[PDB]
Design an enzyme around this catalytic site. Sequence first.
Site, PDB file in Angstrom:
ATOM      1  CE  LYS A 193      -3.808  -2.214   2.583  1.00 21.36           C
ATOM      2  NZ  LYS A 193      -4.779  -2.404   1.468  1.00 21.36           N
ATOM      3  N   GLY A 211     -12.147  -2.418   8.322  1.00 19.95           N
ATOM      4  CA  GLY A 211     -11.888  -2.667   9.730  1.00 19.95           C
ATOM      5  C   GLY A 211     -13.102  -2.892  10.637  1.00 19.95           C
TER       6      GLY A 211
END
Lengths: 277, 276, 277, 277, 274
Positions: D78, D150
């Site tokens: 990322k 998340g």
Amino acid sequence: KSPFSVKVGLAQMLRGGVIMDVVNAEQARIAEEAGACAVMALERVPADIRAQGGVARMSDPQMIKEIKQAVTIPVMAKARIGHFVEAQILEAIGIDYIDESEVLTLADEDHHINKHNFRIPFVCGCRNLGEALRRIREGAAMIRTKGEAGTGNIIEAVRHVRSVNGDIRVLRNMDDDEVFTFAKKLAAPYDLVMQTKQLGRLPVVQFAAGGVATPADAALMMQLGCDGVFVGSGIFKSGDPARRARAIVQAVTHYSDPEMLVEVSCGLGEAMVGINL
Amino acid sequence: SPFSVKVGLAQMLRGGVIMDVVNAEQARIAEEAGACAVMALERVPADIRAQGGVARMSDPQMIKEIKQAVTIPVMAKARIGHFVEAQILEAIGIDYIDESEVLTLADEDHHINKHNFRIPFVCGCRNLGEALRRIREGAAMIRTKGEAGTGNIIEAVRHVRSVNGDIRVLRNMDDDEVFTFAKKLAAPYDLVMQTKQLGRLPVVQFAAGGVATPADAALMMQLGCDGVFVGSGIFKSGDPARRARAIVQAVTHYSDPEMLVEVSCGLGEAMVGINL
Amino acid sequence: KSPFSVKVGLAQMLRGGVIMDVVNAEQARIAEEAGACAVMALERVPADIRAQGGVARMSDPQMIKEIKQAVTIPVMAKARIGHFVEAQILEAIGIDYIDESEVLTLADEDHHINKHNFRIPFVCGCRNLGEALRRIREGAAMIRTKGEAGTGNIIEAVRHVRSVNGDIRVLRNMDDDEVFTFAKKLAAPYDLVMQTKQLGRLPVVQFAAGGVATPADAALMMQLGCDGVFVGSGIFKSGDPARRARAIVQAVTHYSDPEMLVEVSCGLGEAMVGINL
Amino acid sequence: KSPFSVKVGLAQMLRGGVIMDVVNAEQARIAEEAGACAVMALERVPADIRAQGGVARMSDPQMIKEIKQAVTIPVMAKARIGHFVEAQILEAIGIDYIDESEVLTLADEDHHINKHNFRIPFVCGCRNLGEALRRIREGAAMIRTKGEAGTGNIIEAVRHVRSVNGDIRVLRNMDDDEVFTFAKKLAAPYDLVMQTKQLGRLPVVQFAAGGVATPADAALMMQLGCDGVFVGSGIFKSGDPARRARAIVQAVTHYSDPEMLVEVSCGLGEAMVGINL
Amino acid sequence: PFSVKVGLAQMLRGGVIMDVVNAEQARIAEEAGACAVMALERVPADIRAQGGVARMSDPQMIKEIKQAVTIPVMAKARIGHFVEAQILEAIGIDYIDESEVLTLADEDHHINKHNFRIPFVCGCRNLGEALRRIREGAAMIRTKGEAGTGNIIEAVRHVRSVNGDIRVLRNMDDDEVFTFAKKLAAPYDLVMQTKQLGRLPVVQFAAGGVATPADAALMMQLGCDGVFVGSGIFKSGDPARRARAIVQAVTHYSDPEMLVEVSCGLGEAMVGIN
Ligand SMILES: [Cl-]
Ligand SMILES: [Cl-]
Ligand SMILES: [Cl-]
Ligand SMILES: [Cl-]
Ligand SMILES: [Cl-]
Ligand SMILES: [Cl-]
């Protein structure tokens, strides 16, 4: 039978009828000859009250007496809302019904006439079931829709008829325990709400009024469940009142007969132009 | 079913122009120019708009005069919700009733229950939900509302693109999402699914409201309409017989620009109308 | 070269020119004799559309044919925005350009004509760079400012020219990585944005239009970077159109020559009065 | 084969796969052994980024190298949105893909990385078709849903998948003349909108991501039309992390086989508890 | 066929459906006379208190319940999670509850329930919602009530709303039904079917906040076909006793003497939350 029941019974004789506004004795005669079940005596039709403005009051007793002498059918006349003295005067003239009418200039913004203090039956207007029941509790023996006065537009009458009849139908199958709250929400007397539930209709005669301009309009009101119709402006503000008068009467009598409705509507001349609000 | 018979009847009008007429001479001119039907009335939408007043069903006498003057189908207008006007019309023996928003609305909350009649009805719409609601009430034919009495095609274009656009969305939609789509259209699910399967409205669909020129009429056809209504656009023009024929030809030859040129060439004054 | 490039190339022949609105063949001849690079055939000038109102449509093909036969310079004509059939008809008449024009009554509020479906080049209006690029992507071969139509007030044209040219200049030195976001903010196709960046100008011919009333106005538009000008109302709604026509043509040809601008402006007679909004 | 088409082709090899977030080499080995098609190297899973806060950046190149040496499947990592230098560093480490990721802390609020300046393919997130097409025009070779990161709640991923696929379906039968306005309303490049219309799907590989916590979730995404899934948080906190990994891989491979879905879901141990926002 | 699924659910009329978290509880529910059990890993009162994402239960725990009893077993799937429903159907249970007590998985669409062989139950708060769920293929409807509070107020509201609109519909002018269907945003054909039948065309249960025998009998006296109980039971001195009392209350809902007997000395009800 109670004095209220007697008044209610008297208005039931108008069922199936057309009540016509008339401003003089010649018109009263034309209305009667065309088959009106009653005439409503007044010095100004709702279409002229709307156009000209000014304060509109009870008619001169002299003109009312002239109408009452010219016909053998019942005579009604208008009093301003809350103007209990106008109503006293009308009753003392010896007419057959008083219309406590919103087309005249309101005289009391907060209270209607206490109609139980009179011997003569009253008609009152409504736009909904709560209003109808409040007028009846005050002593109205007959109810009409307010519709829209002086325009020739039937839309408001249809709205009011559907509102009243629709709430009557709701009431019919309602859980009895929920009726208390329904009465509260209508702001209507619980006893009259229950009576309407048991009867499945208004406990007095119910007519349409306001904007009935054609035979089709009159028959529509009857097919929607009215007991009869008032016509004001719709006649004598038309091209040929005697013919139009008869046509409306026939439409109310033969409301479910399209062939007859065609015949009475065919070649009727100019209807009132009216006003689209 | 009796509904399927009405819907089948209206199919004959495909490829046609329906013209508003106020008397028998005009009905004859409409028929001679090749109109597929005439719509009988005492006031064109441009005059209803300009003059105001309450606009109702026409006198049955004038309607009978029109019906006798022509051999093509005759339609007439009833006010929205005025089921007794519709009963009268049906009893005169005309071919279609248009439950029309150009007349003064008689019932703000409910349309005529069109399934109670033998005669087919036409109703207006502005979007797919409205079209499907009218069909469920028993309309056998649908038209756009457009904008009435102005000669401005903008609203008709908007309504045609709205209806056809939603139909195209519906065609390839995930089936599982159609329930929510029906809810959002406030339309009956079964008719939504029928429209999905068919890929078009399940009845004949015409453009109406503001068609003033041969170009306008052909535009409506190129956008996917089955035909057009013309009201004001003709007899409020400079030369109605000529203009009538030109609109008819435009609808028949809608994809032929050379023909559209020929019929538009030297047509005289169109209706001035009003930019609202 | 692509069909789009051919159309773009054809409009480049108008560079340095004045396009004049004309309502008949005599006017077309006057425009051509004064040195107009093209005429725009129509039945109503934007100042009369504004004043009279009504729906404004494509002109009768007969009047357009009469204009096309009266002159040897290119003939343009107007179609309503989104009215792709009007455009089909115009193309079939054999004129040289179509103007998809906002001075006519809008026919489609959400979509413009798909101009790539035609062989004839189109002109479209814009007020900003995003709008110009959207019109080009739809297939416009030429762009004009919208300005303000029918008022004789140049303020809006100046605003639009400065808006378009200003954003072109911003784009020229912009960081390439920021161009994606700039394209998004213009709501314009990225490829055309990059082409405009590489070229340092609009990829098609750009004219001023709307409110050009005097020779000074015309030359101002040229000094601001336009390729030519449209004049509508500004001429034949003036005191002496043939002289005013010539003066505007000369102003566009000699836009950076103040001595010439003085000469052509000197004693020109009444300009259009117009309207200050 | 353009350099962009080569990158797009490379990402097509991931179809039918699961990409797993891993924080060390042991986890990378477990992911590979369970049958992951690639691993996403990072120092913090999205559930810990959410809970702990702080600035989340590109991972230490040392930890990324350790992962890349531990496995033979492709390695992704990322970079923060707009942080083109983080992406340069990643490319120079020799990994296989870069994810320009919104779960890391945004580095440029107005501009993404110009992905065409790199040889390595990029993955970007989206919530709708316009966003997807903008990322592709910047040079993304693969697209994922953003979902909700998340939380273990699949609702947002479903919303985004249905939004993207729904607009693709709309586009497929749309009137060609309306596509210009549709492109404007998406704020997406017209050419890519037309390519998507012609293809009937996104022109790059399209994965689901965000909130995939169970085998049922993974198979749901596949039945909604995704090419594969990312899983982050959803795996590694487990009784037997290796078992949940395998179950998700099998669910994606056998997404239309309820019997298989039962088997792999049966007795899986505690899923991530997550958070209902 | 849909009519088969609707017919099956009619067998639950006069019953109590109980939430159970293990096989011992399922046995107690069955022994107390429950008409079905609803297998789940967390009761609505614990979902409310603890939060987290609530999903379909582990198929292993569902299989354990299904083997422990002979009465029908239901289980929950998240709204719109058609794969959870596929899994449940493949386990061989009897009904799926597409349930709002679990975490919503699709904000705009429910499961297309017609794609399944197993019958589904869905929640509603009003007649339009009930009819929409039925058109999507629900074979049984319950009130949403309020989940995990032990407060019956919302269930009463929803039952009165649905039944009240049904009674309005029954004697409505037929011409007005088109507009009524529009205002409910419900399919016209299902509205007319409801009008002709004079009730919902599927089995209709109360759910959400039924904590006492009095509550259960109240729901029956308001016209429900049966009740769901979740939280209301299993935290007890004698869970088995409360279960039996609710079953008896539903069976003898118009018998105050019986209601006294089953309520007498029942131990602590769920405390719940106002
Ligand atoms: Cl007053
Ligand atoms: Cl109106
Ligand atoms: Cl306009
Ligand atoms: Cl951030
Ligand atoms: Cl582009
Ligand atoms: Cl939720």
